[PDB]
Design an enzyme around this catalytic site. Structure first.
Site, mmCIF file in Angstrom:
data_model
loop_
_atom_site.group_PDB
_atom_site.id
_atom_site.type_symbol
_atom_site.label_atom_id
_atom_site.label_comp_id
_atom_site.label_asym_id
_atom_site.label_seq_id
_atom_site.Cartn_x
_atom_site.Cartn_y
_atom_site.Cartn_z
ATOM 1 N N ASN C 375 53.405 56.157 40.428
ATOM 2 C CA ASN C 375 53.930 54.908 40.945
ATOM 3 C C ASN C 375 53.242 54.548 42.260
ATOM 4 O O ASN C 375 52.265 55.179 42.673
ATOM 5 C CB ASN C 375 55.448 55.002 41.104
ATOM 6 C CG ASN C 375 55.865 56.031 42.126
ATOM 7 O OD1 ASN C 375 55.302 57.121 42.193
ATOM 8 N ND2 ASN C 375 56.860 55.690 42.931
ATOM 9 N N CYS C 377 54.502 54.906 45.194
ATOM 10 C CA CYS C 377 54.766 55.993 46.125
ATOM 11 C C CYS C 377 54.219 57.328 45.642
ATOM 12 O O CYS C 377 54.357 58.330 46.350
ATOM 13 C CB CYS C 377 56.270 56.107 46.387
ATOM 14 S SG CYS C 377 57.044 54.573 46.943
ATOM 15 N N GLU C 379 54.994 59.500 43.279
ATOM 16 C CA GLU C 379 55.880 60.610 42.948
ATOM 17 C C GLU C 379 56.586 60.469 41.607
ATOM 18 O O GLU C 379 57.115 61.468 41.112
ATOM 19 C CB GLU C 379 56.926 60.815 44.057
ATOM 20 C CG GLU C 379 58.343 60.361 43.741
ATOM 21 C CD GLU C 379 58.525 58.866 43.856
ATOM 22 O OE1 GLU C 379 57.689 58.215 44.512
ATOM 23 O OE2 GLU C 379 59.515 58.346 43.309
#
Ligand SMILES: Cc1cn([C@H]2C[C@H](O)[C@@H](COP(=O)(O)OP(=O)(O)OP(=O)(O)O)O2)c(=O)[nH]c1=O
Ligand SMILES: Nc1nc2c(ncn2[C@H]2C[C@H](O)[C@@H](COP(=O)(O)OP(=O)(O)O)O2)c(=O)[nH]1
Ligand SMILES: Nc1nc2c(ncn2[C@H]2C[C@H](O)[C@@H](COP(=O)(O)OP(=O)(O)O)O2)c(=O)[nH]1
Ligand SMILES: [Mg+2]
Ligand SMILES: [Mg+2]
Ligand SMILES: [Mn+2]
Ligand SMILES: [Mn+2]
Ligand SMILES: [Mn+2]
Ligand SMILES: [Mn+2]
Lengths: 289, 683, 683, 289
Positions: C375, C377, C379
């Protein structure tokens, strides 16, 4: 019509020598023959010496005689790039590739070289001949400046671009490409200032200024051919370098609003891989017919 | 240097004080004999050639299977029976470089001019051998030229769409904006120019569901569309071209115009997106009286009245909008906006000017919708309905998006053959066939409007060539007299053919009954005014040809009332850019830009004298820049009164012309009934 | 100057050689009694407050209608009975500036911390009063913190979605690219961060229907997505954030990376689009052996094999691709590509690095699909299936697009309360409710995957805060021992809660029977290896809290085999950016960057000491830049072995270390089983 | 011993006004009285004039006469900053805050203001009096330049700093602080060059040069007092500004190696508040752990 636009393009192209790490060039430099290393050194010194004249005299003298605050600012910026950025960049390349004693000897040689001196002194002579409040002498110097920026440098730029296009001396080639990109815009800008003067002249005076420009180009071109053979015959490249000189001579002429002098030629692919009418208000009665 | 290139270059070599115009016949003869006949693939029989073309994925077997091979052979015989010769080198060069079918490696030539014309005619006829022969005679005589998409792609397996002009309405929603981007990319992929109406999009600093000052305006959508057109670049062949239209009373009009300034910021400037401004009569009235005008935020108007600002008549609604406290607006100077428009057109040729009330005062389908915007070439003026593209799970409300099929009569060849009626009717039939055979699977509104409206565009070209070859100055009143009579006849026979098609198929276009054709209001000026030539010289040009009279127009009105009208729109004069060379014709109804056209192809420079240029007619081929733009406006307004859609009207300006002169030309065009202004070309 | 920020600035005034840390308590006390209590709207009773909030479109009536007002009053009493006090000025400031409800004019304060927590708890419980009280106790004790979207929008009428991470698979078609742009704008409009896989897209210079060198590559789609995210920016308060992921064996990998170079041109560089690179073990092996690697043209592989390149195993098909003449490949130097990756991360922090075989060797749902990208981020690591968006008239084949609800355990407060089991189970229930109440009606694949997979992300924060406040160095083996035991226990109780939810609801996630939970292979290391703490210091930290043994894991494995699992994915450790201040916790499981964090808000400068920072634990709060990244990699890999999804792993680099050091850290992370590397932050 | 470090400091301080967004000052500007806005516009216009001449004339002419490529590079860079960066930044401020007519009027006002014309006449006169190879005329121009850099700008700088210190016009104030940071190093550098020339003289000659410097300072000072009163009386700040210019006059003298001339005074505390990674190739052993 153009100074603020060139201001923008100039300042957004700002760069510093420190940005490119040079040491990794030693990994390809060591594999060049003596003639290749010799030609490179001599070409580099040629560019360095000519660019110093442009920084110390060429740009500042034009900035002095041109009227207009915004033009003086752009010209000051260009002079700064010559002295503060380009000159340091050439020095950095030299110090990376050669020991101190070798640098001193190459500069001694190139300083005595007949073809380098001929062109350097021809250009400097025209800068020294500018007279206060005489736009004709200013124009002649601008022509000389455009010829240096857009034409005379290119017999030299050829070699670093030739290596750069082959994957050799990539760090110094990147530096040279940035320098060349600055000289291109310098040549175009000074060219527009020269055309402004040219366009203020009578038809007879224009024809006389055209003859001056072509005559000067011819003198410089014939010396470039000799300069070229002197440096590039030992590495077998002179034929292709000559095509590159003529192609850049045509660009310099176009910068001065003149027609190309030389027939169109293709350029070495390795070097290629390296490379408002008038606002008037509506005053009524224009809506009625 | 090729021999034909040398021969073509000898035109400029002045012998005995005159250009060697006869060298172009030698140039084209040498071009053919030395290059075309060498690079033309030849087959023992036509059957072998046809089999090779269908089996090697060059042609479509569907349309060729509609004929026995004997019929196809006779059609090809008819094409070659004319022994057509290209008069100039540029005609043959343009055809064999742009439209002639080449091998997959683009090395040899499969199609001659006759083969291309035969294939296009066989595709047009759709199984009729006599109709195919009629189309062959029409095109080999060069009386009618199908548009570049139709002429290039008809009967080809690996072809783009036969339509290249599309007009999309964009609704004020993220769903509709995303769908507009998708449809624009899909249509640009097909090779068509896409025009988008951005007037419904709410301006910058508008509320998005209780979050005020959140909308980026029409310029964010403009950037999205510009990148969408840059990406959908027709498989890297030709640059993706799109147009955006905004009403002059839209709040973002100044931001809309600032995208074309030379000093525009890179986060504002758009590169591949042409812009057109729609100007109602209210704006011209406000600028005329120097009253300070108001541009409105469209979403406030939509919230207050339930209707889009561009869906309402600004002439009656402007005072209500200004006096409404719940409608948000900012003061502007309409004269300053006009001067900004003129300055932008001088600098870059943009925006296109569409006079909204000039279009809609003579629009025949105002019941369906008013004409709110034009195409990328500023000649398509049709009613559109915005689509409501809902969420993915929901059902979309499909509207009408404009897409018309283009064809051009050659005025010189139609006039010399005395075949206005026959050429117009056959061109109408071919355009109707192209309309029916067009099915676009990713633009639902375009497909629905193509099926419902059945609109076609039949243009004309070689007006200046025909006039100069007949000793008539383009600005002369006799030229306007000829244009009046010729285009009245074209309109008469296009209406007659449309009503005949409606009678044959028993169907009219959708919502025909509300049109001015149904009520007879369209025919008022034709049953009241006589459009026969007022000059003996012009009346002699139409000798041997029946010019429709007032009684003929009354009979046509009765016929249309009885049987209806098949096409909502029939006539639009497109620029006709590259097909003009092949037809040896001057582009569209515009006057010629240059007497002799100097162009460079590859490393060799080419010279193209205007068709029919000689010593006797040299000064009748007056260049457009040397002309009075007021007289060109007069000519186009004379033509525009017989064209139901618009005309691509390019302004040809000198360098000495000021902003005031361009504004005067625009205001005189508005005064004379000009619907759209295409380009401001400066010398 | 405000009194509270003046008191907060007295922390740095060193008195007797020590920072005045107690000033922050005075700072927050002054902040409250001088700004918050003054600007707080107070109602006579809670009934008037709730009526005012519901009537004026602040809350949602539907979720508040499931409780009688006596139950809501009891919940609010439970929230206020704790008498929670913010320990620092930054905690209260961040809450009342980012998450506290304010009036429509952003003038006064409607929600306190207790009010927001009570509303979130009543939203979570969905009619259950006791469950609402349990959630109130969980959040007021700050044992569990819902993510910023959930905590900010739970129970609010004019709200965005409760999920902000979305992952989209883009198929190799213009229809799919248009749908990807549309869905990206729709999800960015909702406030979510969107990640897109660009590996299935064919490279630059590939054919589009037998015309070669036609595709613009992934960089054109990158520009489209960048402008789509710039357009959908939500007022620009939080501009649209997107991420693009490309497999390292894609031919466009060098152009994909060149979009982040500082010297990139405006026609190539993307600004609002983060980039990630997916690296299979094959690439690392090729670089290790200094062999010549090959990047491939995806369309050639798809044509030859019928499958996309990223849908195939590169470690088993790379040699077949190289040996296949019909596959088009380009020669690259894998070590040069690794050095370029390191240089790009040093100069910009990009790309994100995903070690694909590290993700998929432990991935529990490889039967559904392999994890192909992360994603925004870096994670979220879940199986995805690409959608087949067809023409408008045709039905679309909807795949599985990833999205999970985020939530963080506070390790310090969970360990203080000895409530790992209860906190994990209640957080799992809350995340399940957030998943069930999410319905994205403009992203069909996101909606389908949310309904089918039922994936949640339960992270943790305050790991470094807990260790530093317990006298444990982050790099110490005792810290990794604690992380091992803690996250094994979290995994145990999350699996237990998922199995209990599946048993209660009688349903598992789609295609559960093919997962490693169903086969029991997931539990191998848990039934074979004991994860009890190896150090007596760590073992006392878990005193009073049962640590599951191998027998407990065998019982849980039997329970899962007999009842199934409700969530395909349960645990993911997100960055937890701004909620860390509110919870007075260190961000995520990463080490702290600064001991005292200096920030400027408007024209005010304020300092934030790390939670619990003092002189007795000053050196246990070692900054992330001063510690060995190898030991941080060891810690993250110890945590990662109990996390089914990834961990947002930021690399904290000094200026002295070269690109070789960054490459060594990346290779050690790949060796140690690190799934993703988030950022290369340099001081 | 110093040029290289000044070169590095100057190039590392490089900036453009476009880096600072100015629309944030729109409201605090709108809120000022007409008197305050008038003084502010005029103050910045006076600064613009000084930088125009420092960039067009002062720095380039000193660069021409100072020996050494590195010294020339520093002076050329400083010249560029004056007219391409500093003078232009004021127009960025004007174009944000003021309508075109007010901008036109203030530039007309500089042309006719007697104190601004007098100070330009005096400073530029000394620049244009420099004679080649005449170190004394050069020293006199360097004193004039230090007085422009370190003294004359400060009657102008006071007001943006005074607002910045109250949290008003902070974006414009950020620009001004960057300009001030540059002028401080420019004044030190030119001061060091002036001291070089002064230190070559006999004691008798030195005594005359101190007389020149002090007489010039007093003459400029007396004119600056009248200028200050003319601008600041309408905003009530003339006495405060006068203290500030005396403070900075002492700094200018110190930059020239001379003792302070004015007694110390308390300055308004508001105004005081107004003040790639190295690429290393991967080894084989880097892939095993
Ligand atoms: C239409 C178009 C596609 N593409 C690229 C993006 C897509 O990933 C890829 C596929 O386009 P498609 O939409 O699938 O085109 P197609 O189906 O007609 O071609 P094919 O038979 O090969 O599938 O082509 C461009 O780069 N530019 C374009 O204008
Ligand atoms: N032979 C032949 N004819 C071609 C070709 N392309 C177009 N034609 C046209 C020329 C004639 O008008 C028509 C029939 O040609 P043919 O098959 O040679 O006929 P025929 O003269 O033997 O009866 O087809 C072509 O490639 N070969
Ligand atoms: N009175 C009041 N109570 C509020 C408000 N916001 C939250 N509360 C909490 C405080 C208590 O825990 C709970 C009940 O408050 P109340 O309605 O005044 O009841 P009570 O104090 O008469 O029992 O609601 C608020 O605005 N007013
Ligand atoms: Mg809407
Ligand atoms: Mg496809
Ligand atoms: Mn230079
Ligand atoms: Mn130069
Ligand atoms: Mn300055
Ligand atoms: Mn200075």
């Amino acid at each position: 019509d153009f100074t603020q636009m060139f201001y923008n393009q100039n300042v957004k192209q700002f760069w510093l020598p420190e940005e490119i790490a040079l040491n990794g060039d030693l990994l390809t430099w060591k594999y060049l023959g003596k003639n290749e290393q010799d030609t490179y050194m001599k070409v580099l010194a040629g560019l360095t010496l000519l660019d110093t004249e442009q920084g110390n005299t060429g740009m500042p003298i034009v900035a002095e005689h041109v009227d207009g605050h915004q033009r003086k600012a752009v010209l000051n910026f260009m002079a700064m790039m010559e002295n503060a950025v380009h000159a340091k960049s050439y020095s950095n390349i030299f110090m990376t590739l050669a020991p101190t004693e070798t640098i001193n000897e190459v500069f001694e040689w190139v300083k005595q070289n007949k073809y380098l001196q001929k062109k350097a002194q021809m250009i400097v002579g025209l800068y020294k001949a500018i007279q206060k409040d005489d736009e004709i002498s200013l124009f002649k110097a601008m022509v000389a400046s455009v010829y240096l920026e857009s034409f005379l440098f290119y017999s030299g730029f050829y070699y670093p671009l030739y290596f750069y296009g082959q994957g050799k001396l990539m760090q110094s080639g990147e530096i040279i490409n940035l320098i060349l990109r600055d000289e291109a815009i310098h040549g175009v800008y000074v060219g527009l200032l020269a055309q402004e003067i040219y366009n203020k002249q009578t038809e007879e005076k224009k024809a006389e200024l055209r003859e001056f420009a072509i005559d000067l180009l011819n003198q410089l071109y014939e010396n470039e051919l000799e300069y070229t053979e002197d440096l590039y015959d030992q590495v077998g490249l002179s034929h292709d370098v000559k095509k590159f000189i003529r192609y850049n001579a045509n660009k310099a002429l176009m910068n001065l609003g003149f027609d190309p002098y030389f027939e169109e030629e293709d350029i070495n692919p390795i070097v290629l891989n390296g490379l408002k009418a008038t606002v008037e208000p509506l005053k009524d009665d224009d809506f009625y017919f | 240097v090729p021999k034909w290139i040398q021969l073509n270059n000898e035109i400029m070599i002045q012998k005995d004080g005159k250009f060697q115009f006869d060298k172009d016949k030698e140039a084209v003869h040498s071009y053919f004999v030395d290059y075309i006949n060498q690079n033309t693939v030849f087959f023992h029989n036509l059957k072998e050639k046809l089999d090779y073309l269908v089996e090697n994925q060059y042609y479509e077997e569907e349309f060729l299977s509609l004929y026995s091979f004997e019929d196809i052979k006779e059609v090809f015989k008819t094409a070659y029976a004319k022994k057509f010769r290209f008069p100039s080198f540029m005609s043959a060069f343009k055809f064999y470089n742009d439209y002639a079918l080449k091998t997959n490696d683009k090395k040899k030539i499969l199609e001659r001019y006759e083969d291309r014309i035969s294939i296009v005619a066989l595709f047009f006829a759709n199984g009729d051998t006599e109709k195919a022969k009629e189309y062959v005679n029409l095109m080999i005589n060069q009386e009618y030229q199908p548009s570049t998409p139709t002429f290039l792609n008809a009967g080809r397996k690996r072809r783009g769409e036969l339509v290249s002009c599309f007009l999309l309405e964009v609704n004020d929603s993220l769903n509709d904006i995303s769908r507009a981007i998708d449809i624009s990319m899909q249509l640009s992929k097909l090779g068509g120019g896409v025009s988008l109406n951005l007037s419904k999009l709410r301006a910058k600093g508008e509320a998005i569901k209780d979050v005020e000052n959140a909308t980026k305006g029409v310029v964010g959508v403009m950037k999205l569309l510009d990148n969408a057109f840059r990406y959908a670049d027709q498989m890297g062949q030709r640059q993706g071209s799109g147009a955006a239209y905004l009403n002059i009373f839209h709040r973002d009009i100044n931001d809309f115009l600032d995208t074309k300034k030379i000093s525009a910021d890179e986060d504002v400037r758009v590169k591949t997106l042409s812009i057109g401004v729609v100007i109602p009569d209210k704006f011209v009235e406000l600028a005329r009286e120097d009253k300070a005008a108001y541009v409105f935020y469209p979403h406030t108007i939509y919230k207050e009245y339930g209707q889009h600002m561009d869906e309402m008549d600004m002439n009656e609604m402007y005072d209500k909008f200004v006096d409404n406290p719940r409608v948000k607006k900012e003061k502007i100077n309409p004269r300053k906006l006009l001067e900004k428009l003129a300055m932008l057109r001088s600098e870059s040729g943009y925006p296109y000017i569409m006079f909204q009330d000039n279009v809609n005062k003579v629009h025949a389908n105002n019941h369906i919708s008013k004409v709110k915007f034009s195409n990328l070439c500023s000649e398509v003026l049709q009613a559109s309905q915005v689509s409501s593209y809902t969420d993915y799970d929901e059902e979309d409300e499909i509207g009408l998006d404009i897409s018309c099929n283009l064809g051009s009569l050659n005025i010189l060849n139609v006039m010399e053959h005395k075949s206005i009626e026959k050429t117009v009717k056959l061109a109408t039939d071919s355009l109707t066939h192209v309309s029916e055979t067009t099915d676009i699977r990713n633009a639902p509104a375009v497909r629905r409007a193509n099926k419902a409206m059945k609109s076609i565009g039949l243009g004309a070209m070689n007006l200046h060539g025909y006039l100069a070859q007949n000793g008539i100055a383009y600005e002369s009143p006799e030229a306007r007299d000829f244009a009046n009579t010729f285009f009245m006849m074209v309109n008469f026979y296009s209406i007659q053919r449309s009503a005949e098609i409606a009678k044959e198929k028993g169907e009219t276009f959708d919502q025909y009954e509300g049109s001015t054709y149904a009520t007879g209001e369209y025919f008022d000026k034709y049953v009241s005014t006589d459009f026969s030539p007022k000059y003996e010289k012009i009346a002699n040009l139409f000798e041997g040809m029946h010019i429709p009279t007032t009684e003929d127009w009354k009979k046509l009105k009765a016929f249309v009332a009885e049987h209806g009208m098949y096409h909502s729109y029939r006539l639009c004069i497109a620029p006709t850019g590259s097909i003009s060379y092949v037809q040896s014709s001057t582009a569209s109804v515009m006057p010629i830009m240059e007497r002799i056209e100097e162009r460079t192809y590859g490393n060799s420079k080419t010279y193209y004298p205007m068709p029919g240029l000689a010593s006797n007619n040299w000064f009748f081929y007056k260049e457009a820049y040397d002309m009075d733009m007021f007289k060109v406006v007069d000519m186009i307004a004379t033509i525009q009164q017989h064209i139901d859609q618009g005309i691509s009207f390019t302004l040809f300006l000198k360098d000495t012309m000021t902003t005031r002169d361009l504004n005067r030309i625009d205001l005189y065009a508005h005064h004379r009934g000009i619907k759209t202004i295409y380009y401001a070309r400066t010398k």
